[PDB]
Amino acid sequence: CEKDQFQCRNERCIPSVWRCDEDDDCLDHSDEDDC
Amino acid sequence: NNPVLLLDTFDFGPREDNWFFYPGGNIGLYCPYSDSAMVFVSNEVGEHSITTRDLSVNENTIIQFEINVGCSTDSSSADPVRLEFSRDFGATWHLLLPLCHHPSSTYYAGTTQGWRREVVHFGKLHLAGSVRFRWYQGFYPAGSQPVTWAIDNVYIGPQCEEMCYGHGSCINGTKCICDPGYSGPTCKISTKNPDFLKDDFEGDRFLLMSGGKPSRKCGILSSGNNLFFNEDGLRMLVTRDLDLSHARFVQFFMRLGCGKGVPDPRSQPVLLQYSLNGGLSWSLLQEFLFSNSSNVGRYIALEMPLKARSGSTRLRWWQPSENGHFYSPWVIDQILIGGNISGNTVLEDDFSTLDSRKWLLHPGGTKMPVCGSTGDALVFIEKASTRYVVTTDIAVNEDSFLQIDFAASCSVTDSCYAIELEYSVDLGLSWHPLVRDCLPTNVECSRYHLQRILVSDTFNKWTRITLPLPSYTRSQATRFRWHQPAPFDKQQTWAIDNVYIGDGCLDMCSGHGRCVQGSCVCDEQWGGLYCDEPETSLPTQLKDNFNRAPSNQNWLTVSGGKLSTVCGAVASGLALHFSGGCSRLLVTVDLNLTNAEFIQFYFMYGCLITPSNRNQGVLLEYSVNGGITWNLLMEIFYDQYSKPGFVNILLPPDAKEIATRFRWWQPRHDGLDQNDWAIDNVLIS
Ligand SMILES: *[C@@H]1O[C@H](CO)[C@@H](O[C@@H]2O[C@H](CO)[C@@H](O)[C@H](O)[C@H]2NC(C)=O)[C@H](O)[C@H]1NC(C)=O
Ligand SMILES: *[C@@H]1O[C@H](CO)[C@@H](O)[C@H](O)[C@H]1NC(C)=O
Ligand SMILES: *[C@@H]1O[C@H](CO)[C@@H](O)[C@H](O)[C@H]1NC(C)=O
Ligand SMILES: *[C@@H]1O[C@H](CO)[C@@H](O)[C@H](O)[C@H]1NC(C)=O
Ligand SMILES: [Ca+2]
Ligand SMILES: [Ca+2]
Ligand SMILES: [Ca+2]
Ligand SMILES: [Ca+2]
Ligand SMILES: [Ca+2]
Ligand SMILES: [Zn+2]
């Protein structure tokens, strides 16, 4: 996974800037769980 | 002939002879912010006021004092302090400064937390004679809790010269004490003020913000907060003193009315005014009327009037009213003041910093790296209702060009989307497309291109784009805008970097470099002062059979195309089939065509769906300047090539340069797997 990225529990990688933004970007909302 | 009439610093008790009455008054400290003052405390029963003795005032007489009402941010229309006079020994009383354009001599709570100096010039407004003055709040039964207030440092006597230009206190009509930053025996000279103002209200720009909170109510811009004038008392917003000598504009968002239907007629207008003398006198810039078409949030951009141009101008928005009561509120947002009259020719950026003087507005945009950029880019990646960036005004001429690095989603989504790119010559009151959608329909063009250049598949990753600026972008004040039209998903991200809009690198670095401070920084494999000497031998030939994967040694760009058998044998084996839903575009590496004779290839339309109309025909163009300009070689007509045909064209002399590239592109199609086309056995030799 990439540095400016965040790894979901999906194994999915999203831009780390989508972590904590009131959108579910992982599709298991693990980008939103800890905010 | 002009005696000092009253002076009181209250600095160990008042001077008895100054005053006839001060019911409710005490000596002490109130609101130790902007030592001894005359304080009128809430709890005190009865009249809260202070009255001078009778005074012989004349043509030259001013009243000057310090005051603080309420020590708060709570705007209220209740228990204001009125400065009044009497020509009949207190029999009746009148506002010293009526309301008109300027507010009355009434001092409301919440206007400023801190103390402020005030001055009224009696003799300019009123005749000479025997006169009485007071600062009156009201009369309070036990239990009442009116706002606390205080006066300090009261002077009644001759005005100083030029009134100290508004930037100083007047001692006895002979000497001025200039506010910090002001000097000269009249406070005329001004220390360098800023020539720029930007307030988003999402957060010293303002001297007062009276009658308005930061709210999300009544919004225009769905990013965030605005300034909501819904309160009672004084509705006024006042800028710091600004250097506007070379300013071009004042722009802002404004809405008049926040109601069900049409705002009522009795609603007082909002006044935009200016002052070159620290608030003493105000000239109208613009009246804003409540009307049947006012209840809607809208963009206002105004040119700086000649009379406002000075190293020390301040602006205000004020809504007049008799009694601090209002019929319909108003909202204001995104205030920018600035620009340059020199309207310079060069705006340049690598986004190591994000200067707002260059980038007026950037909703949805973040200073961050993305997609292996060099340092930071301006990035539109976060959750946004809106994504755009507007430049400040620059002057655009014959030698002016736009050059930016652009990137769409960088393999985040496979969406087909396009970023609009626009220009304005009327300060953003109206936007026009930079590149206007044009095709071989008429001699009306000789260059061919699409309105939507910045497309997501073509520009997946960082790609430079250089445009010589069209004649209709030539003005003294052209601003530019990158626009993502709504609706749009979040994952349709995009970004810009390495922006040069200007006239500093003639020839545009020949298409093989970027302009950086009037010098070319060349792309790898290129050197020289203007990037026109290649570092190695470019290939003299292009041959492709499409029996294997298109290589990076032949093609710079393949959009909408893949290897397929769907067409049958076009030449032989696999052909490169174009049937994608977005761009359908084929572009060669730069080729040394010094000694090249021809271009040839086999070609077929509609392996899936036959092309519907002329504009769906693939065009073949060449460039001898890194793709900055393209020259049509062939319109590959749509109704021809229903079965595979062979195309052989002689290179024109102007195409035979040391670095020539080719493109095939479809301007139009009905979308995925519609109006498709295939190319096989490409040969440039
Ligand atoms: C703004 O709206 C008002 C309210 O409808 C318009 O005034 C009315 O005009 C009609 C027809 O001319 C009259 O019958 C009403 O008596 C008016 N209503 C009142 C009380 O004002 C007005 O014409 C509109 N303004 C403009 C510029 O079109
Ligand atoms: C201003 O004039 C008054 C005259 O009554 C005097 O008392 C005071 O000292 C003068 N102030 C200054 C600073 O000269
Ligand atoms: C005006 O021009 C000068 C360059 O001479 C520049 O430093 C300044 O920032 C410009 N002001 C604005 C608001 O563009
Ligand atoms: C272009 O081709 C000619 C001969 O074909 C060669 O002499 C020249 O060096 C070439 N230029 C480059 C830089 O490839
Ligand atoms: Ca998220
Ligand atoms: Ca004092
Ligand atoms: Ca705002
Ligand atoms: Ca950069
Ligand atoms: Ca083939
Ligand atoms: Zn647009």
Contacts with B412 from chain A: Cβ below 8 Å: 15
Give domain B192-342's CATH architecture: Sandwich (2.60)
Kindly list the protein residues that place their beta carbon closer than 5 angstroms to ligand 6, a single-atom ion: B 9-11, 36, 152
Structure letter (DSSP) for residue B591: B
Q: State if residue B262 touches ligand 1 by the CB under 6 angstroms criterion.
A: yes
**In degrees, to the nearest 5, what angle opens at C-alpha B421 toward C-alphas B418 and B426?**
150
What is the C-alpha to C-alpha distance for residues B165 and B169, in angstroms, rounded to an integer? 10
What is the C-alpha to C-alpha distance for residues B113 and B97, in angstroms, rounded to an integer? 23
For the stretch B60-90, what's the b/e string if a residue is b when 16 or more beta carbons lie within 10 angstroms of its beta carbon?
Answer: bbbbbbbbbbbbbeebbbebbbbbbbbeeee
Find, among B246, B253, B124, B235, the residue nearest to B193 by Cα.
B246
**In degrees, to the nearest 5, what angle opens at C-alpha B659 toward C-alphas B654 and B660?**
55
For B265, the token pair is 């007629």
Find, among B494, B519, B462, B196, the residue nearest to B348 by Cα.
B519
What is the C-alpha to C-alpha distance for residues B544 and B551, in angstroms, rounded to an integer? 9
CATH superfamily of the domain spanning B1-191: Galactose-binding domain-like (2.60.120.260)
Any residues with CB less than 8 A from the CB of B372 and at least 6 apart, and which? B461, B462
For B187, the token pair is 């406070």
Cβ pair B259, B329 in contact under 8 A: no
Structure letter (DSSP) for residue B652: P
What is the C-alpha to C-alpha distance for residues B398 and B508, in angstroms, rounded to an integer? 12
Find, among B267, B286, B394, B403, the residue nearest to B341 by Cα.
B394
What A17-21 contacts at long range (C-beta under 8 Å, 24+ apart), as own/partner pairs, is A17/B366, A17/B368, A17/B381, A17/B382, A18/B381, A18/B382, A18/B383, A18/B490, A21/B382, A21/B383
Kindly report the three-state secondary structure assignment for every residue of B129-186: EEEEEEEEEEEECCCCCCCCEEEEEEEEEECCHHHHHHCEEEECCCEEEECCCEECCC
Cβ pair B271, B288 in contact under 8 A: yes
Q: How many residues does chain A have?
A: 35
Q: Which of B383, B412, B493 sits opposite A23 (nearest CB)?
A: B383
B308 backbone dihedrals φ, ψ, rounded to 5° = -85, -15
For B130, the token pair is 């025997």
Q: For the domain covering B343-536, report its CATH number.
A: 2.60.120.260
Cβ pair B466, B511 in contact under 8 A: yes
What is the C-alpha to C-alpha distance for residues B234 and B237, in angstroms, rounded to an integer? 10
What is the C-alpha to C-alpha distance for residues B195 and B338, in angstroms, rounded to an integer? 6
| Backbone angle region of B172, left / alpha / beta, with phi > 0 → left and psi within -120 to 50 → alpha | left
Cβ pair B408, B417 in contact under 8 A: yes
Experimental method: X-ray
Q: How far is B372 from chain A (nearest CA, A)?
A: 10
| Distance in Å, CA B163 to ligand 6 centroid | 22
For B640, the token pair is 């021809």
Which residues does a gap of C–N over 2.5 Å follow in chain B?
34, 100, 203
Find, among B497, B553, B557, B500, the residue nearest to B372 by Cα.
B497
The topology under which CATH files domain B537-685 is: Jelly Rolls (2.60.120)
Find, among B327, B330, B331, the residue nearest to B266 by Cα.
B327
Residue A15: asked if its preceding bond is cis (omega within 30°), the reply is no
Q: How far is A17 from chain B (nearest CA, A)?
A: 7
Residue type, B558: V
> Would the CB atoms of B382 and A21 count as touching at under 8 Å?
yes
Residue B600, judged by CB atoms within 10 A of its CB (0-12, 13-18, 19+), counts as middle
B601 backbone dihedrals φ, ψ, rounded to 5° = 180, 155
Q: For the domain covering A1-35, report its CATH number.
A: 4.10.400.10
Domain residue ranges in chain A: 1-35
Cβ pair B68, B31 in contact under 8 A: yes
What is the C-alpha to C-alpha distance for residues B157 and A35, in angstroms, rounded to an integer? 63
**In degrees, to the nearest 5, what angle opens at C-alpha A6 toward C-alphas A4 and A12?**
125
Cβ pair B481, B390 in contact under 8 A: yes
Q: How far is B433 from chain A (nearest CA, A)?
A: 31
Find, among B294, B286, B304, the residue nearest to B197 by Cα.
B304
What Å resolution does this PDB entry report?
2.6
**Kind plus residue range of the DSSP H or E element containing B679:** strand B677-684
What is the C-alpha to C-alpha distance for residues B99 and B323, in angstroms, rounded to an integer? 10
What is the C-alpha to C-alpha distance for residues B678 and B262, in angstroms, rounded to an integer? 60
What is the C-alpha to C-alpha distance for residues B367 and B358, in angstroms, rounded to an integer? 14
Any residues with CB less than 8 A from the CB of A10 and at least 6 apart, and which? A26, A27, A28, A30
Among B382, B385, B411, most A C-beta atoms within 10 A, so best to mutate, is B382
What is the C-alpha to C-alpha distance for residues B645 and B503, in angstroms, rounded to an integer? 45
DSSP B240-252: PPB--TT--EEEE
> Would the CB atoms of A4 and B490 count as touching at under 8 Å?
no
B320 backbone dihedrals φ, ψ, rounded to 5° = -60, 150
Q: Give the torsion sign (CA, B468, B471, B473, B475).
A: positive
Q: How many CB pairs under 8 A join A and B?
A: 19
For B527, the token pair is 């050197």
**In degrees, to the nearest 5, what angle opens at C-alpha B553 toward C-alphas B666 and B636?**
25
The answer to the question of whether A31 is labelled as a binding residue is yes
> Would the CB atoms of B370 and A4 count as touching at under 8 Å?
yes
What is the C-alpha to C-alpha distance for residues B464 and B498, in angstroms, rounded to an integer? 9
What is the C-alpha to C-alpha distance for residues B369 and B663, in angstroms, rounded to an integer? 30
Find, among B360, B488, B378, the residue nearest to B428 by Cα.
B360
Find, among B60, B314, B51, the residue nearest to B170 by Cα.
B60
List the end-to-end C-alpha distance of chain A, in Å, as a whole number.
21
Q: Which chain B residue is nearest to residue A19, measuring alpha carbons?
A: B382
Contacts with B368 from chain A: Cβ below 8 Å: 17
For B630, the token pair is 């393209």
Cβ pair B606, B676 in contact under 8 A: yes
> Do the two domains B1-191 and B537-685 of this chain adopt the same fold?
yes
What is the C-alpha to C-alpha distance for residues B285 and B306, in angstroms, rounded to an integer? 11
Q: What is the CA radius of gyration of chain B?
A: 35
Find, among B191, B154, B151, the residue nearest to B169 by Cα.
B154
CA distances from B456 to B13, B136, B414, B422 (A): 76, 68, 8, 17
What is the C-alpha to C-alpha distance for residues B134 and B40, in angstroms, rounded to an integer? 13
CA distances from B545 to B540, B566, B574 (A): 17, 16, 8
Neighbour count for residue B211 (Cβ, 10 Å): 28
Any residues with CB less than 8 A from the CB of B649 and at least 6 apart, and which? B598, B599, B600, B620, B633, B634
Find, among B398, B394, B388, B470, the residue nearest to B425 by Cα.
B394
Neighbour count for residue A7 (Cβ, 10 Å): 15
For B514, the token pair is 């970027």
Cβ pair B55, B156 in contact under 8 A: yes
Q: How many residues does chain B have?
A: 685
Give nearest CA residue, ligand 3 atom 9.
Answer: B357
| Distance in Å, CA B256 to ligand 10 centroid | 26
Kindly report the three-state secondary structure assignment for every residue of B251-320: EEEEEECCCCCCCCCCCCCEEEEEECCCCCCCEEEEEECCCCCCCCCEEEEEECCHHHCCCCEEEEEEEC
Kindly report the three-state secondary structure assignment for every residue of B90-132: CCCCEECCCCCCCCCCEEEECCCCCCEEEEECHHHHCCCEEEE
| Distance in Å, CA B652 to ligand 9 centroid | 27
What B364-369 contacts at long range (C-beta under 8 Å, 24+ apart), as own/partner pairs, is B364/B223, B364/B388, B364/B484, B365/B389, B366/A17, B368/A17, B369/A4
DSSP B440-492: TT-TT-SS-B-S--EETTTTSS-EEEEEEPPGGG-SSSBEEEEEEPSS--TT-
What is the C-alpha to C-alpha distance for residues B674 and B667, in angstroms, rounded to an integer? 13
Residue type, B445: C
Structure letter (DSSP) for residue B626: T
Cβ pair B413, B407 in contact under 8 A: no
B621 backbone dihedrals φ, ψ, rounded to 5° = -130, 160
What is the C-alpha to C-alpha distance for residues B644 and B389, in angstroms, rounded to an integer? 46
Q: Which chain A residue is nearest to residue B366, measuring alpha carbons?
A: A17
Local structure of A17: helix, strand or coil: helix
Residue B53, judged by CB atoms within 10 A of its CB (0-12, 13-18, 19+), counts as middle
Cβ pair B182, B163 in contact under 8 A: no
Structure letter (DSSP) for residue B13: B
Local structure of B615: helix, strand or coil: helix
For the stretch B294-324, what's the b/e string if a residue is b when 16 or more beta carbons lie within 10 angstroms of its beta carbon?
Answer: bbebeeebeebeeebbbbbbbbbbbbbbeeb
Neighbour count for residue B535 (Cβ, 10 Å): 11
Cβ pair B363, B431 in contact under 8 A: no
What is the C-alpha to C-alpha distance for residues B248 and B518, in angstroms, rounded to an integer? 25
Ligand 2 pocket (Cβ < 6 Å) reads B 4, 7, 171-172
> Would the CB atoms of B382 and A4 count as touching at under 8 Å?
no
> Which atom, in ligand 3's list, is nearest to the CA of B392?
14
Cβ pair B4, B56 in contact under 8 A: no
For B399, the token pair is 């030698």
Q: State if residue B292 touches ligand 1 by the CB under 6 angstroms criterion.
A: yes
CA distances from B501 to A3, B157, B280, B658 (A): 32, 58, 42, 27
Cβ pair B307, B227 in contact under 8 A: no
Cβ pair B134, B156 in contact under 8 A: no
Biggest CA pair distance of chain B: 113
For B544, the token pair is 């492709």
Cβ pair B680, B548 in contact under 8 A: no
Neighbour count for residue B333 (Cβ, 10 Å): 24
List the end-to-end C-alpha distance of chain B, in Å, as a whole number.
102
Find, among B307, B300, B237, the residue nearest to B275 by Cα.
B307
Cβ pair B618, B636 in contact under 8 A: yes
How many CA atoms lie less than 13 Å away from B22 in the CB half-sphere?
A: 20
> Would the CB atoms of A23 and B381 count as touching at under 8 Å?
no
Residue type, B95: L
Place of tokens 């071989």: B440
Domain residue ranges in chain B: 1-191, 192-342, 343-536, 537-685
A5 backbone dihedrals φ, ψ, rounded to 5° = -115, 160
Ligand with smallest separation from the Cα of B224: 7
Give nearest CA residue, ligand 4 atom 8.
Answer: B537
> Would the CB atoms of B383 and A4 count as touching at under 8 Å?
no
Contacts with A23 from chain B: Cβ below 8 Å: 383, 490
What is the C-alpha to C-alpha distance for residues B483 and B422, in angstroms, rounded to an integer? 8
Ligand 3 pocket (Cβ < 6 Å) reads B 195-196, 338-340, 342, 357, 392
What is the C-alpha to C-alpha distance for residues B119 and B125, in angstroms, rounded to an integer? 13
Place of tokens 């500093």: B504
Ligand with smallest separation from the Cα of B685: 4
